[PDB]
């Protein structure tokens, strides 16, 4: 990617090359994406566990 | 001799641990040759508190179960010492290390009765029997069965449970490196117990059926009590009714959800605009 | 962290049990004299000794 | 008779006493007053009810009691069974 | 609180000093509060630590419960007893319900402890109602599970 | 001690085979055996990023509280984690939060071993309050 | 800390016997209003008490 | 007034006395609880307006 909207015209370095380059990337990118959404849950679980761990250990 | 001063037998965790530990100490026998040892505990009470156990070297053969060695001399000498420790410690009976009782056990019992004032044969097992009790307590009884059997000396069960003492109980917690997912104090523990319950029932339930078969064929003598009790279980049966839960749990939880969201709605504009100015500030601040 | 939190729940009970022994008898009776703080308080006993005492969480 | 039979027809009770329905009715009137056993008697002739409140509450508590004893029974029986099971020492 | 110790020689102190016992071992030196205990320690002996030996087998013995607990959970809790609990739970709930009702008019702000002082007393009235709903829930859970379960299995 | 600690060393550089060893050693009696069960997976994988190993070390330590296993478990993470030094505090912060000297002991150690070469600011800072504490 | 009878902190509570005395007997406090309109009478009690306690200089 | 807790049956012209107690304690109190909640959820609806 040096874009993600619609542009260019095909050559297998044109729209076809760019469009296929994006799909080769998308499998790698998906792992990046699920984790950024995952971070919100992780902190929720973290705050509650830190209070709970401090009380039981105390 | 009396076997009297028992209606209940509670056994300490000390008793079990002493037998596995003592196996290595003596000879590293390891239930290759079954061991009988003294069972020590309290007296002048209706309930029997088995405070303690020590091994006596007893080897019973695996060629033959009628031959054994039992070291008598140790018993008299150990007697005087028990008072040095405490004056509540006297010889209550004997222990069998299992895996099971014998007919041979009546003969082992007559020797031990001379010392004790309340002899009982309690099988403490070197292997823990399941997740249940690793101990079963029995007492020697003269009884007839209407199976056409005249007078026998046999072992009929008396209720066993596990007890503890104030000193000992504390010490157990410290030693333990388990945390207990089977504590059974609360709802979290209680749900585990129900899953296990069903599994427990199944393990017990199989035995009852094989016993019934043995009487039928593969001839085994009928213990009349067992048959009498079995028939009782099936007759009480009724069918189920009601029990349900309300929508109320949700309502409270939703209440918490509103409060935060209202605080959020006023804060939003403030917090989101400011972010861009602080963001820029941070990157520069970090360098120094 | 998820499984951990469940683990920690079991620890709370274990702990609760252990403390409970300490918590019970021998227990002396005072009168609640005054509050220095809400973590330590002053209570005055019935042989006349005034005590600086910690508050054990198992009440409000 | 009253304690065993939750329900009897007035008519059946007469056959059981070997006295007519009318005579049995008068006896019960006197009996209920002494309070030896509670009864409800009808002059309709439908039924004589002994120890029934006509509430679901009774059935709910009764239902529970039978199941509660049963669990207790299984766990005790198996202890004795364990002794039988070993074999070659009985036989 | 229990401690193990080892005697220290008079000649050892002068030349060696007490930190010589500390070498080539764990070397934890105990303080059992102040007072006589500590003072006597210092003049007399070196105290050394306690570890517990354990074995897997040893644990297994301790953890063991009862055959009887197997049926205990299963047991169908009486309706009678349950009803006592149910009555107890709805009555506390009604009292608190009012409090809950006044409480929601305000509470535009976060920080739940402040809401507890305002609604009056330690802990929120929403939380008090839930606590009661949950206790009932626990009684109910054993009874209903048990009710079907028992009937089917013996049958 | 000499032999339990030796098992890890021979097993060096086989990686995956070591997985099998941590569980078995733990299954054996004494706390000593269990301790050096934590060291084997860590020595073997030697700077390779492996998800499964970190999970097991963490779970064994939390689930069954035993002095030998909790200290050893934490310490091992610093070796698997060695290859990238910045990632490490975020995992390790949770063990440091638990009040217990043995757990603290490894959590501190773990930061020193990983960060040893190319370090990071945050790692160093975490150690300081434990140094300051009266617990030896 | 009664582990040696050694002083832990100095206590920020320190009960005054003068306050106790005032309480046990019972005085319901009042003000000038209650008698109010006998101006000379209130003015005289202020002269004697108020001025020599607050400022001894007067 | 319920001063014997019975019912007069007109369709036979017979009087019946039975155990037919008014209500019961769990349900009676619960009825009042479910009512109160209805007012609370309404309040929650007003508060809730502000989000949208």
From which experimental method does this structure derive? cryo-EM
Residue D59 touches chain H, beta carbons under 8 Å: no
DSSP state at residue E75: S
Q: Which residues pair with B142 in a beta bridge?
A: B153
DSSP state at residue A5: S
Torsion, CA A13, CA A15, CA A20, CA A26, rounded to 10: 120
CA angle F47-F52-F58, nearest 5°? Answer: 95
Q: Which of B169, B136, B140, B142 is nearest to B155 (CA)?
A: B140
Task: Report how far residue D67's alpha carbon sits from residue D75's, in angstroms, rounded to the nearest whole number.
Answer: 14
* Residues F46 and F79: beta-carbon distance below 8 Å: yes
**What is the dihedral sign for C-alpha E87, E89, E92, E95?**
negative
Q: For strands B121-124 and B135-145, give the pairing.
A: antiparallel
Token digits of residue D78: 């198996």
Q: What is the largest CA-CA distance in chain G?
A: 65
Helix, coil or strand: residue C26: coil
Helix, coil or strand: residue D37: coil
Q: Which of F88, F107, F109 is nearest to F98 (CA)?
A: F107
Task: Report how far residue B125's alpha carbon sits from residue B132's, in angstroms, rounded to the nearest whole number.
Answer: 12
By the 10 Å C-beta count (0-12 exposed, 13-18 middle, 19+ buried), E79 is classed as: buried
DSSP state at residue D64: H
In order of A49, B272, D28, F60, F103, the CA distances from A39 in angstroms are 15, 19, 80, 25, 26
- Number of Cβ pairs < 8 A linking chain D and chain H: 13
Token digits of residue B69: 């060695």
**Which residues of chain G does C45 touch, with a Cβ-Cβ cutoff of 8 Å?**
none
Q: Which residues pair with B137 in a beta bridge?
A: B122, B158
- Render the burial of H5-24: b for 16+ CB within 10 Å, e for the rest: eeeeeeeeeeeeeeeeeeee
Task: Report how far residue B124's alpha carbon sits from residue B16's, in angstroms, rounded to the nearest whole number.
Answer: 6
Q: Which domain holds residue E92?
A: 74-148
Task: Report how far residue F84's alpha carbon sits from residue H19's, in angstroms, rounded to the nearest whole number.
Answer: 79
Q: Which of B9, B22, B4 is nearest to B58 (CA)?
A: B22
Cβ pair B262:H47 closer than 8 A: yes
In order of A15, C38, F97, H17, the CA distances from A8 in angstroms are 5, 71, 54, 93
Q: What is the largest CA-CA distance in chain H?
A: 64
Cis amide leading into F122 (omega within 30): no
Task: Report how far residue B40's alpha carbon sits from residue B44's, in angstroms, rounded to the nearest whole number.
Answer: 14
| Resolution, Å (one decimal) | 15.4
For residue F125, how many C-alpha atoms fall within 13 Å in the half-sphere facing its CB? 5
Instruction: Give the neighbor-by-neighbor strand order of the sheet with B121-124.
Output: B52-55, B36-41, B90-96, B121-124, B135-145, B149-158
Least CB–CB distance from E87: residue in H26, H32, H47: H26
Cβ pair A56:C15 closer than 8 A: yes
Cβ pair A45:C5 closer than 8 A: yes
* Residues B258 and E126: beta-carbon distance below 8 Å: no
* Residues B94 and B108: beta-carbon distance below 8 Å: yes
Cβ pair H12:D54 closer than 8 A: no
Runs of H (alpha helix) within C1-60: 2-23
For chain E, how far is it from start to end, CA to CA, in angstroms? 55
CA angle B12-B14-B15, nearest 5°? Answer: 75
**Which residues of chain G does C42 touch, with a Cβ-Cβ cutoff of 8 Å?**
11, 13
């Amino acid at each position: 990617m040096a874009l993600d909207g619609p542009e260019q015209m095909e050559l297998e370095e044109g729209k076809a090359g760019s469009g296929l380059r994006q799909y080769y990337l998308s499998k790698i990118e998906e792992l990046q994406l699920i984790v950024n959404d995952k971070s919100q849950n992780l902190r929720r679980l973290q705050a509650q566990r830190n209070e709970l761990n401090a009380k039981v250990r105390l | 001799m009396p076997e009297l001063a028992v209606q209940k037998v509670v056994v300490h965790p000390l008793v079990l641990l002493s037998v596995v530990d003592h196996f290595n100490r003596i000879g590293k026998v390891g239930n290759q040759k079954r061991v009988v040892g003294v069972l020590l505990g309290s007296w002048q009470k209706k309930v029997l508190d088995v405070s303690n156990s020590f091994a006596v070297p007893f080897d019973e053969d695996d060629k033959d179960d009628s031959v054994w060695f039992l070291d008598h001399d140790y018993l008299e000498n150990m007697y005087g010492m028990f008072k040095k420790v405490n004056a509540r410690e006297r010889i209550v009976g004997w222990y069998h290390t299992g895996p099971k009782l014998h007919k041979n056990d009546i003969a082992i019992n007559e020797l031990m009765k001379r010392y004790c004032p309340n002899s009982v044969l309690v099988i403490i097992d070197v292997k823990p029997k399941d997740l249940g009790l690793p101990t079963e307590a029995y007492i020697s009884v003269e009884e007839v069965h209407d199976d056409g059997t005249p007078t026998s000396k046999t072992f009929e069960h008396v209720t066993s449970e596990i007890g503890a003492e104030e000193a000992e109980e504390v010490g157990v917690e410290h030693l333990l490196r388990d945390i207990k997912d089977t504590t059974v104090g609360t709802l979290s523990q209680r749900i585990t117990n129900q899953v296990h319950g069903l599994k427990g029932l199944n393990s017990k339930l199989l035995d009852i059926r094989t016993y019934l078969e043995k009487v039928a064929s593969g001839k085994l003598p009928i213990n009349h009590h067992i048959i009498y009790q079995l028939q009782d279980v099936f007759n009480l049966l009724p069918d189920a009714s009601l029990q349900e839960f309300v929508k109320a749990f949700y309502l409270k939880t939703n209440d918490q959800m509103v409060v935060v969201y209202l605080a959020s709605l006023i804060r939003s504009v403030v917090a989101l605009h400011n972010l861009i100015n602080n963001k820029i500030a941070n990157r520069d601040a970090e360098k120094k | 962290i998820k499984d951990e939190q469940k683990n920690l729940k079991k620890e709370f009970l274990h702990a609760q049990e252990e403390v409970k022994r300490i918590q019970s008898i021998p227990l002396v009776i005072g009168q609640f004299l005054e509050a220095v703080d809400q973590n330590t308080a002053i209570v005055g006993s019935t042989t006349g000794s005034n005590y600086y005492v910690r508050i054990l969480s198992t009440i409000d | 008779m009253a304690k065993y039979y939750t329900r009897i027809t007035m008519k059946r009770m007469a056959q059981l006493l070997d006295l007519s329905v009318d005579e049995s009715e008068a006896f019960l009137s006197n009996l209920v007053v002494n309070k030896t056993i509670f009864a409800k008697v009808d002059r309709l002739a439908g039924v004589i009810n002994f120890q029934r409140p006509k509430d679901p509450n009774n059935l709910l508590n009764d239902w529970s009691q039978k199941l509660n004893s049963l669990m207790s029974l299984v766990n005790k029986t198996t202890h004795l069974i364990a002794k039988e099971e070993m074999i070659h020492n009985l036989q | 609180v229990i401690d193990a110790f080892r005697l220290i020689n008079a000649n050892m102190m002068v030349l060696g000093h007490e930190p010589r016992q500390t070498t080539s071992n764990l070397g934890h030196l105990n303080k059992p509060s102040i007072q006589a205990l500590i003072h006597g320690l210092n003049r007399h002996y070196y105290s050394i630590t306690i570890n517990y030996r354990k074995n897997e087998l040893e644990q297994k013995m301790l953890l063991n419960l009862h055959k009887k607990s197997w049926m205990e959970g299963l047991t169908l809790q009486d309706y009678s007893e349950h009803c006592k609990h149910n009555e107890s739970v709805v009555k506390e709930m009604l009292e608190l319900a009012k409090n809950y009702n006044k409480a929601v008019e305000e509470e535009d702000k976060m920080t739940p402890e402040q809401l507890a002082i305002k609604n009056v007393g330690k802990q929120d009235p929403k939380r008090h109602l839930e606590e009661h709903v949950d206790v009932l829930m626990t009684s109910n859970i054993v009874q209903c599970l048990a009710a079907m379960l028992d009937t089917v299995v013996f049958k | 001690r000499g032999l339990a600690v030796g098992i890890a060393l021979v097993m060096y550089g086989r990686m995956e085979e070591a997985d099998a060893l941590i569980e078995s050693l733990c299954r054996d009696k004494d706390p000593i055996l269990r301790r050096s069960g934590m060291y084997t997976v860590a020595m073997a994988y030697c700077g390779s990023g492996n998800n499964k190993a970190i999970r097991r070390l963490l779970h064994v330590a939390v689930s069954d509280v035993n002095d030998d296993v909790r200290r050893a478990a934490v310490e091992s993470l610093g070796f698997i984690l060695f290859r990238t030094p910045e990632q490490c505090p975020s995992v390790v912060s949770l063990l440091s939060e638990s009040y217990n000297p043995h757990v603290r002991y490894g959590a501190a150690m773990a930061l020193g071993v990983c960060c040893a070469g190319t370090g990071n600011k945050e790692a160093i800072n975490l150690l300081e309050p434990m140094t300051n504490d009266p617990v030896n | 800390r009664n582990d040696s009878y050694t002083l832990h902190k100095i206590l920020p509570n320190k009960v005054d016997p003068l306050v106790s005395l005032m309480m046990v007997e019972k005085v319901p406090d009042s003000t000038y209003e209650m008698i109010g309109g006998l101006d000379k009478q209130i003015k005289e009690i202020k002269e004697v008490i108020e001025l020599p306690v607050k400022h001894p200089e007067l | 007034d319920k001063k014997f807790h019975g019912i007069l049956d007109q369709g036979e012209g017979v009087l019946i006395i039975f155990d037919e107690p008014p209500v019961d304690k769990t349900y009676e109190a619960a009825l009042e609880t479910i009512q109160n909640m209805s007012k609370v959820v309404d309040s929650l609806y007003n508060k809730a307006k502000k989000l949208t």
